[PDB]
């Protein structure tokens, strides 16, 4: 129950690819109430990204099998029930992250960078809920994702330089929300193109600590652009 010890256990878990352990450690760190440092923020992000990503991946495989099984009642009933089991796991995970974001991380974010990071995370995890929502709940979840992104977007355009890795990543995921969730390729493309072009024009502003993430995100922006236009 010491902060630095739980963080070290978290990086041990990460090296062992035991991401449930790593996520449980940094939930414990977050629950101690203090604002997270950049390192702890990153370990909380990587942990839960891996925990939720396995379920997302499993969900897509089982969903596709249950789509292709339309004529065999007993097999479709089993694929459906398994997909819903994975779905419940995925929702509990997102709801876990989103609870930490509202109870601890967003209200404690002192500086714009922290605030934009946690609002990006809030949009990301509602987006994962949107990927699996249907009907009644889907409308409200999609809007929650959108409103989180938009606040992060506005704050980042006013306070962060265009090569800041968080601003770029926010643009990258927000564009994907417009493409895949809101079905608006126009806005997705323009929002990614703008972010790439304003970054490309100021590469003298890259620091050694952040140029690797910034240039990777830029490449991903352009790859999304190449995919969406063809």
């Amino acid at each position: 129950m010491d902060k630095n010890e739980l963080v070290q256990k978290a990086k041990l878990a990460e090296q062992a690819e035991r991401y449930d352990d790593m996520a449980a450690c940094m939930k414990s760190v977050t629950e101690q109430g203090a604002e997270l440092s950049n390192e702890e923020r990153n370990l909380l992000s990587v942990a839960y990204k891996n925990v939720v990503g396995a379920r997302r991946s499993s969900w897509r495989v089982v969903s596709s099998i249950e789509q292709k099984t339309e004529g065999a009642e007993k097999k479709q009933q089993m694929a459906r029930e398994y997909r819903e089991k994975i779905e419940t796991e995925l929702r509990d995970i997102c709801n876990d992250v989103l609870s930490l974001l509202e109870k601890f991380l967003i209200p404690n974010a002192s500086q714009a960078e922290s605030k934009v990071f946690y609002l990006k995370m809030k949009g990301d995890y509602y987006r994962y809920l949107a990927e699996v929502a249907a009907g009644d709940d889907k409308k409200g979840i999609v809007d929650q994702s959108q409103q989180a992104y938009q606040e992060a977007f506005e704050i980042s355009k006013k306070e962060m330089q265009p090569t800041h890795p968080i601003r770029l990543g926010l643009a990258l995921n927000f564009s994907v929300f417009y493409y895949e969730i809101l079905n608006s390729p126009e806005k997705a493309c323009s929002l990614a193109k703008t972010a790439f072009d304003e970054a490309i024009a100021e590469l003298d502003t890259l620091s050694e600590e952040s140029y690797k993430d910034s240039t990777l995100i830029m490449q991903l922006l352009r790859d999304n652009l190449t995919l969406w236009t063809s």
């Binding site: 990587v46 990258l172 991903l220």
Partner: peptide
């Protein structure tokens, strides 16, 4: 093939 988000490696 799919949409790229960051962080990756899901």
């Amino acid at each position: 093939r799919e949409n790229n988000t960051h962080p990756e490696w899901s």
